[PDB]
Design an enzyme around this catalytic site. Structure first.
Site, PDB file in Angstrom:
ATOM      1  N   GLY A   1       0.939  -1.319  -0.023  1.00 54.85           N
ATOM      2  CA  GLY A   1      -0.016  -0.217   0.035  1.00 54.85           C
ATOM      3  C   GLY A   1       0.829   1.384   0.010  1.00 54.85           C
TER       4      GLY A   1
ATOM      5  CG  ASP B   1      15.880  -6.934  -1.138  1.00 53.65           C
ATOM      6  OD1 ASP B   1      16.904  -6.660  -2.186  1.00 53.65           O
ATOM      7  OD2 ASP B   1      15.001  -6.377  -1.402  1.00 53.65           O
TER       8      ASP B   1
END
Length: 337
Positions: free
Chosen positions: A22, A133
């Site tokens: 979102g 990551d």
């Protein structure tokens, strides 16, 4: 509901500014009388739910100065009414990606940033977690140069016993920061995958450009071997996987490019540490504690002020239908009610 620009429904968090994906907004905290960052999460595909639960489970267990904390979590009082989840975090002015786009870093900032990255990573690894990551985008900074690691969406419990896979297996984490063994024979379930990424970040801090900007899966390995040179016989003997070994043997010979030729301005201690983080063979690659103890970081190194995790993740969190993960997400977020 407050609409940002659409529903962004958050009592004690009054003022409000939009900022990216979102969606994410700045807001003012009336209890703590500070601006805060709030992420609206609407995840209830299976993919987004596993990622969301994993990230919440990790961040709520961790408490460390160099890892983003969860301050608050806003959601409905019932599973039926829970459509979105809002995650409240410390507001951070910037990130290292944005900083390196416009600003040359002094050697002192490089050293301090690298120290905080490794001090947070020492904690992560001590919890038996891999970030998987690490990149400039995922290193948040405030105006006094405090650094916090964020984005645990691809984090996993370490599992070096099950790290072997085939040649050019699909991989999700950011191409430019991927250790060479990801392309050859690794699932990225070893702590050495994060050290490679930190090495890539250190190189990026020294020159304001990605050191290995591959255009694709195999080009990434070619960028790596263009600097490191052709792997040694002994490092190839460690690769049992025939397709990966034969691929490496198919490549033209390449000589190592010395770090001081790439970075003639750089502190020689920084380059010695860089060399040890960007080692081809993951078994020979430096461990996070050894990196902290390296001479480059001697002004900061203090093991009594480099905490380890009270509650490591002893076992894998296994994959579960959406309904179960939604229910897990509800239970995990209960303490903020």
């Amino acid at each position: 509901a407050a609409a940002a620009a659409q529903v962004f429904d958050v009592p004690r968090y009054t003022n409000l500014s939009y900022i990216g994906e979102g969606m994410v907004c700045s807001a003012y905290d009336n209890l703590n009388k500070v601006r805060v960052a709030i992420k609206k999460i609407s995840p209830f595909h299976q993919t987004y739910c596993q990622r969301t639960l994993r990230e919440i489970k990790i961040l709520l267990r961790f408490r460390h100065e160099n890892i983003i904390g969860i301050n608050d979590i806003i959601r409905a009082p019932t599973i039926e009414q829970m459509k979105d989840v809002y995650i409240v975090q410390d507001l951070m002015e910037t990130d290292l990606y944005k900083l390196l786009k416009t600003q040359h870093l002094s050697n002192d900032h490089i050293c301090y940033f690298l120290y905080q990255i490794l001090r947070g990573l020492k904690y992560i690894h001590s919890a038996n977690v891999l970030h998987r990551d690490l990149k400039p985008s995922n290193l948040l900074l405030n105006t006094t140069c405090d650094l916090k690691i964020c984005d645990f969406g691809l984090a996993r419990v370490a599992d070096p016993d099950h790290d072997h896979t085939g040649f050019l297996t699909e991989y999700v984490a950011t191409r430019w920061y991927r250790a060479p063994e990801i392309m050859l024979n690794s699932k990225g379930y070893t702590k050495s995958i994060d050290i490679w990424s930190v090495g890539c970040i250190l190189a990026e801090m020294l020159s304001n450009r990605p050191i290995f900007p591959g255009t694709d899966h195999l080009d990434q390995l070619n960028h790596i071997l263009g600097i490191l040179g052709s792997p040694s016989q002994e490092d190839l003997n460690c690769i049992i996987n025939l397709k990966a070994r034969n691929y490496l043997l198919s490549l033209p010979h390449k000589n190592k490019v010395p770090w001081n030729r790439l970075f003639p301005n750089a502190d020689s201690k920084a380059l010695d540490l860089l060399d040890k983080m960007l080692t081809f063979n993951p078994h020979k690659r430096i461990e996070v504690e050894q990196a902290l103890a390296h001479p480059y970081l001697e002004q900061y190194y203090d093991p009594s002020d480099e905490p380890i995790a009270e509650a490591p993740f002893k076992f894998d969190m296994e994959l579960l239908p959406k309904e179960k993960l939604k229910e897990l997400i509800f239970e995990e977020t209960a303490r903020f009610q």
